[PDB]
Symmetry: C3
Subunit: 276 residues, 3 copies
């Protein structure tokens, strides 16, 4: 057997990414996620100080890109392409992923490049498939050609970000133009006036909107649902998203934190367990 | 396909090993061999100058260990655990091993870590599976999850000790509290007074007991069986096990060596061919 | 499964190659191509400044070798052995090769050594199978044990020369005692007097014989067939094979080049597109 059949299918979605800033020359790969919107994902540090981000496809179509946004902590960034006809790959679930699963790291450093290995450990994915500068921000796929992760930069040891997590950050960037991680597996956003009155609240109302609560995280289990609004963490008032990361990070691990929330006009309070 | 099914089964037997001496901090992995006795094997240099050897299991049970003994030349050491409920892995035969066989190097450097490759050459096993400090003394297993070797430290090139050989040294350590390799594939031991009269000899009788003769080695083929007793190698008398390695090492390769033995009360003499 | 069955079959054809010159000591591997003629191939730089090239087989038969010739650009060289009984391997087609295909790099650095990986990219073959000094000039084989390439020296990244190309250069060396690469995928040779009158031409006739035109190359598509004879490239006369590489290299990429040829007594002219 071989992987050629299934890599043939993965290939088209993998792009090359050249960056020029200040003169600067950066090169990495990227994966097309939504061809009907022209959306691709690559590493965050590749497009750092980016002045000219140029994407080259498989068919050689050189195109210019628009950084919708990027995330530091996962080293991920999202770009938009204003083009059509694009093809993507079949994408899988990183939840089904187990150590021992075979794995291939693809990229496009020039004008392909695939390395084989397995998953070594399992919030990134460790692998003995050889990742490179040329193929960071590229596609890590399973033995079925399903996209299970995005390559990053760091030995004999590679790391990728599980595509579930990857897609979660891209969406926040797509829907909000940004991404802000608060406490214990939740994502928060600035509760703008227009967002406030989109949720039945007053224009003058302030807080940190919870844009997503990851399942079985301490906050989900502390009872915090998405669409809630934090106004106070302990004896400190909250009025923007960045304050959550700030307030939380200034409290020792495993501490009881009383956080006032506001779910559908009713104020609550949630006792929560701080995680490092 | 994948290896997850079979690595799931291997995992429980793999331990983490933390060592403190003189302040010193050493970390490696190890494999549980006999759960009904609490016996684990790891690398010898990990527990060097060991003052505190602490073992952490899969279920997180941190336990203290007792160095039964260790071997330098194979870089192997044996530890005892005074605990119950333990599970081991399925263990194979290193004789069935051939170059080309797939292979996975597992360890437990933190709190898993598995790398894939094949057997490169075949008295250790060379492999392109990536071994590390974190995963030396850990389990090398075949494509069937059978334990075929123990990882060691040294590139793109790893080495393991064939589990047959590994089990042979552990047993000597278990049965005798030590291990001494004499000439051409044989293992010798101090013929203590209590051992002498356990074999029908006199209390006052002296020699180097042969505790094991490996099959098809020059000494087996020179006719030397286990349970024999060397009293003289050439014109030099023998009275303890260490003298065999000493006497033999001082003779050029492929030399004729006349060794008086004593098998069941009858003295013999064996013409033997020195191997480097 | 495993690869042992199929590596067993490959092994015999793989040789060790030790070189002594000026004191010099070089070591690499090589593959037996034609056992009925005693022909082996290895890397070119291994037998550089070679004064004593000694080959050792699998059965340990140490034999002396005769450098028929070698090629720099592909880093390949051909040696002859004046011996019998030899066995070779099953050899494949590098055209069927695709990225994702599994792959094993074998050699004989001592007295075997095989590493596993896939084809990474595709005029050499890139692979994440680990090549070494010890195993350069050795056999890269597919998952079927078919010889698909010859290992070379250069990271996490190996390179081999597709066996089709490899066999093409060896034959030129075998048939002509040399190899000279002209323009855009063609091979040229000195049109010696004896060769001239072997092709119906006069003894006094001069030019650069085309000893092979690779399919779908610019020159094939420019209409140039093997067995033709170049006498002029542009306004410059041609009288030996080395002049083609010389003339061509002194013209910018993608230029129109008018080359007088002489196919079966009739002069032509061929408009050709220069490739870098």
């Amino acid at each position: 057997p071989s992987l050629a059949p299934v890599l043939k299918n993965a290939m088209p979605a993998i792009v090359n990414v050249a960056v020029q800033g200040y003169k600067f020359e950066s090169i990495g790969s990227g994966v097309i996620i939504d061809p009907k919107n022209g959306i691709i994902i690559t590493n965050d540090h590749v497009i750092r100080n980016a002045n000219l981000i140029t994407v080259t496809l498989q068919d050689g179509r050189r195109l210019k890109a628009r950084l919708i946004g990027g995330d530091s902590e996962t080293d991920l960034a999202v770009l938009k392409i204003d083009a059509k006809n694009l093809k993507s790959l079949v994408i899988g679930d990183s939840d089904k992923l187990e150590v021992g699963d075979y794995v291939v790291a693809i990229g496009n450093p020039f004008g392909q490049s695939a390395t084989f290995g397995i998953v070594s450990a399992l919030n990134f994915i460790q692998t003995d498939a050889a990742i490179n500068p040329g193929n960071a921000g590229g596609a890590l796929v399973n033995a079925k050609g399903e996209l299970i992760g995005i390559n990053t930069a760091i030995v004999g040891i590679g790391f990728a970000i599980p595509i579930n997590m990857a897609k979660d950050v891209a969406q926040q960037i797509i829907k909000f133009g940004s991404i802000h991680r608060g406490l214990m597996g939740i994502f928060v956003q600035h509760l703008t006036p227009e967002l406030a009155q989109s949720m039945g609240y007053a224009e003058d109302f302030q807080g940190a909107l919870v844009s997503q609560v990851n399942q079985n995280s301490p906050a989900q289990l502390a009872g915090l649902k998405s669409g809630d609004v934090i106004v106070q963490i302990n004896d400190t008032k909250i009025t923007q998203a960045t304050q959550v990361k700030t307030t939380i990070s200034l409290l020792r691990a495993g501490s009881t934190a009383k956080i006032k929330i506001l779910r559908d006009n009713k104020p609550l309070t949630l006792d929560v367990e701080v995680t490092d």
